[PDB]
Amino acid sequence: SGFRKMAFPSGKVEGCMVQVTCGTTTLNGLWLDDVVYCPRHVICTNPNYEDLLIRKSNHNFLVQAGNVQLRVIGHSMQNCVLKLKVDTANPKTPKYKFVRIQPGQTFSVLACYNGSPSGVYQCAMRPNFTIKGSFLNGSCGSVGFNIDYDCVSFCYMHHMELPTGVHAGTDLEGNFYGPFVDRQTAQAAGTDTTITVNVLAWLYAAVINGDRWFLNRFTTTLNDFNLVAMKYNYEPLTQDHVDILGPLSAQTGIAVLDMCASLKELLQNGMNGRTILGSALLEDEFTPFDVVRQCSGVTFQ
Amino acid sequence: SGFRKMAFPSGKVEGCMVQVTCGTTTLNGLWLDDVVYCPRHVICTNPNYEDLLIRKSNHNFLVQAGNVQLRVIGHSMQNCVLKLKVDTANPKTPKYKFVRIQPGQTFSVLACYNGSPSGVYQCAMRPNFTIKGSFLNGSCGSVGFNIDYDCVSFCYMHHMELPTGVHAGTDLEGNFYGPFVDRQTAQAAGTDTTITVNVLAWLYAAVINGDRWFLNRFTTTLNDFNLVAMKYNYEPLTQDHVDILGPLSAQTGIAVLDMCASLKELLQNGMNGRTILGSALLEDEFTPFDVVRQCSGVTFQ
Ligand SMILES: *CCC(=O)N(CCC(N)=O)NC(=O)[C@H](CC(C)C)NC(=O)[C@@H](NC(=O)OCc1ccccc1)C(C)C
Ligand SMILES: *CCC(=O)N(CCC(N)=O)NC(=O)[C@H](CC(C)C)NC(=O)[C@@H](NC(=O)OCc1ccccc1)C(C)C
């Protein structure tokens, strides 16, 4: 027992991280097979990146993999990522896929500086397509991922920090999550919501772990719950959401709509001093899969 | 910016994890050079472990390192750990040290099942020598660690779960943290406290990240603060604690005793609906070093 914001082991990703330097810009690069993927704003000197990239050579790009020079033999822009063809394949390349995630889904971030792993932490993709990350200068190029047995599902690469301290990047094809662009404009995250199905998943994590004080005798229809959800800036709850909670429902014996009734009183009455899994807030950054994995015993290799 | 419960990259530890099986017990083993360290209750069949270990052979112990058999050529008890001498050194052994930590200090846990990494998360050693971990059956043998440049400071190996859902283990010499033993008795964690210097470190993390609403014009002496600390089951604050916060003090310009005054009103008045770094609680599982590392940019390799 216990419940913790837990990341995937980072070792498979640590082996793909590299330092890309061209001009006076240094950022992080992701090395898979013979390509280094990195943010295109590593390119020298409002920008017309196609224009600025024709102006570059291969030798402009200094790729450090630990202590080893990586000779770039080609380059190419893919949306907002750069793809640097190097003469050596990464012998540590894990099995991988580039998969775009939905808001509501979570991933682990390996924050990196100068191609060196710094820390690992778990995030979710916010309804407004930002992420509440932890990133300093030089962190761009650091990737978000999930593991599924032995396969690394790369889903995010980090690009910029928005004025609210939240973070914006792209999937690994260079397509930004959300209405964000890799320049300097007055960009701001849009109004965010709470991920209802994630909060419900976490209430089931609380019940699996013996926290039951918020449980209750009441029930409610889907439509009535949803009337209280929007009132509190919570995402609508769909029937699929309810089916995805089925396993947690059936394991704890609490009907999904019954757990909704409890979320209703929690939203309407607050938490009256108590805590749920050591939190005084309704946590929304655990999916039903995260809960089932942490409270069943699933591994990865 | 941002502030997140961040772990060290786990890759260096992932490479040391192995599955130890003897009898019908399977747990996790830590493979460094030619020794596998593991909890001694892997031993077969209230126990007199010296008695039960003379009754074992080397071949009793099945060590799996991924897909590879590891031949045990010797064994030995060290307090509550077992040391299994194997015929092959771990070529992935990082530079390491076995260091015992103090309550108040933090570490990253690589939870493992059957010798396979499952997740990584950040913990602290509670004042009562437990840890609020996240562990299921078969997790014992999983280690806690810190990284310092390239060196892995192993500090914890996990052994058991206490009735409150909190966790107890040993440093890597087999000496338990706290008055806990590796058998089945009516053991229970003792009354815990809050790590004051850690909460103050986190208030500075909040101020470094733009959360300032709890700041205030007031000051207080050390003795007066400590009168309010004990009243709220908070650890006493020593002068050394204040010196260890010096850098955070000097970086934000807020005197340590001034930050104490703010912690006083927070304890006495609560948080009045607001949140600090996205928490509705006063967090105590970040040390001053954790804050400085996350809000300066430090890496490890
Ligand atoms: C690649 C460098 C890096 O490490 N970045 C991540 C920084 C972080 N803390 O997440 N990325 C940047 O520093 C980028 C570099 C550009 C070439 C993309 N710049 C930023 O993220 C700035 N943010 C920003 O400009 O957002 C748009 C904006 C501009 C003006 C007013 C409001 C919003 C940030 C200030 C460093
Ligand atoms: C090594 C097996 C393992 O995975 N463990 C970690 C379990 C966990 N969730 O952290 N360890 C155990 O299961 C140990 C095995 C013993 C051989 C050490 N057992 C426990 O942790 C039990 N806890 C326990 O007995 O605590 C003492 C106690 C006994 C009776 C009443 C109150 C307290 C636990 C019930 C599995």
* C-alpha–C-alpha distance, residues A51 and A139, integer Å: 25
A8 touches chain B (CB under 8 A): yes
Substitution candidate for ligand 1 out of A37, A135, A166, A184 with most atoms within 8 A of CB:
A184
- Give dist(CA A80, CA A172) in Å, integer: 9
Is the CB of residue A263 less than 8 Å from the CB of residue A207? no
Query: Residue B222 is inside which H or E element, if any?
Result: helix B222-231
Starting from the CA of residue A111, give the closest ligand.
1
Which residue does chain B place closest to A299, by CA atoms? B118
Indicate which residue's Cα is closest to atom 18 of ligand 2.
B182
**Rg of chain B in Å (alpha carbons):** 22
Q: Classify residue B5 as exposed, middle or buried by CB count within 10 Å of its CB (0-12, 13-18, 19+).
A: buried
**Which stretches within B29-86 are classed as H helix?**
49-54
Give the C-alpha separation, A60 to A173, whole Å. Answer: 23
Distance of CA B300 to CAs A36, A66, B35, Å?
21, 12, 25
Q: What residues in B contact A284, CB-CB < 8 Å? A: none
Q: Is B257 helix (H, G, I), strand (E, B) or coil?
A: helix
The tokens for A220 are 């409610």
CB contact under 8 A, A301 and B166: no
Q: Which residue, among A252, A168, A146, has the nearest Cα to A204 in the 3D structure?
A: A252
Beta carbons within 8 Å of A260's beta carbon, 6+ residues apart:
A200, A220, A222, A225, A237
Decide if A260 contacts A200 (C-beta within 8 A): yes
Alpha-carbon torsion, ordered A28, A31, A36, A37, to 10 deg: -60
> Which residue's entry shows tokens 């437990």?
B130
CB contact under 8 A, A9 and B279: no
Q: Rounding to the nearest 10 degrees, give the CA dihedral for residues A52, A53, A57, A62.
A: 100
Task: Indicate the pairing of strand B151-161 with strand B96-98.
Answer: parallel
Query: What is the rounded distance in angstroms from the CA atom of residue B27 to the CA atom of residue B17?
Result: 10
Q: DSSP character for B102?
A: P
> What angle, 0 to 180 degrees and rounded to 10, lies between the N-to-C axes of helices B222-231 and B256-269?
30
Provide the experimental method for this PDB entry: X-ray
Q: Which of B3, B6, B112, B130 to mutate to probe the A interface, most A CBs <10 Å?
A: B6
Residue with CA nearest ligand 2 atom 14? B160
Any idea which residue has 């996240």 for tokens? B134
In this structure, are strands A96-98 and B116-124 parallel, antiparallel, or unpaired?
unpaired
Nearest ligand to residue B112 Cα: 2
The ligand minimizing its distance to the Cα of A43 is: 1
Which domains can be identified in chain A, with CATH numbers?
1-14+95-192 (2.40.10.10), 15-94 (2.40.10.10), 193-296 (1.10.1840.10)
The amino acid that residue B55 corresponds to is: R
Alpha helices in chain A (DSSP H): 11-14, 49-54, 196-208, 222-231, 239-244, 246-252, 256-269, 288-294
Look-up: residue for tokens 């099945």?
A: B62
Ligand 2 site, residue B135, Cβ cutoff 6 A: yes
For residue B49, what are its two tokens?
């472990």
CA-CA distance, B150 to B148, in Å (whole number)?
A: 6
Report chain B residues whose CB lies below 8 A from the CB of A12. Answer: 11
B161 lines ligand 2 (CB under 6 A): yes
Q: How far from B125 is each of B50, B105, B157, CA to CA, in Å?
A: 29, 6, 12
DSSP secondary structure letter of residue A42: G
Our measurement of the distance from residue A212's CA atom to the centroid of its chain's CA atoms, rounded to an integer in Å, reads 29
- B11 φ/ψ angles, rounded to the nearest 5 degrees: -60, -35
Nearest CB partner across the interface for B110, out of A9, A136, A281:
A9
Paired with A29 in beta bridges are: A18
Of A132, A106, A127, which is closest to residue A192 (Cα–Cα)?
A127
Only one residue has tokens 């059957």, namely B114
DSSP class of residue A233? T
- Active site residue ranges of B: 41, 140
State the greatest distance between any 2 C-alpha atoms of chain A, in Å, as a whole number: 69
d(CA A260, CA A245): 11
Sign of CA dihedral A26, A28, A32, A35: negative
Identify the sign of the CA torsion A136, A54, A178, A5. Answer: negative
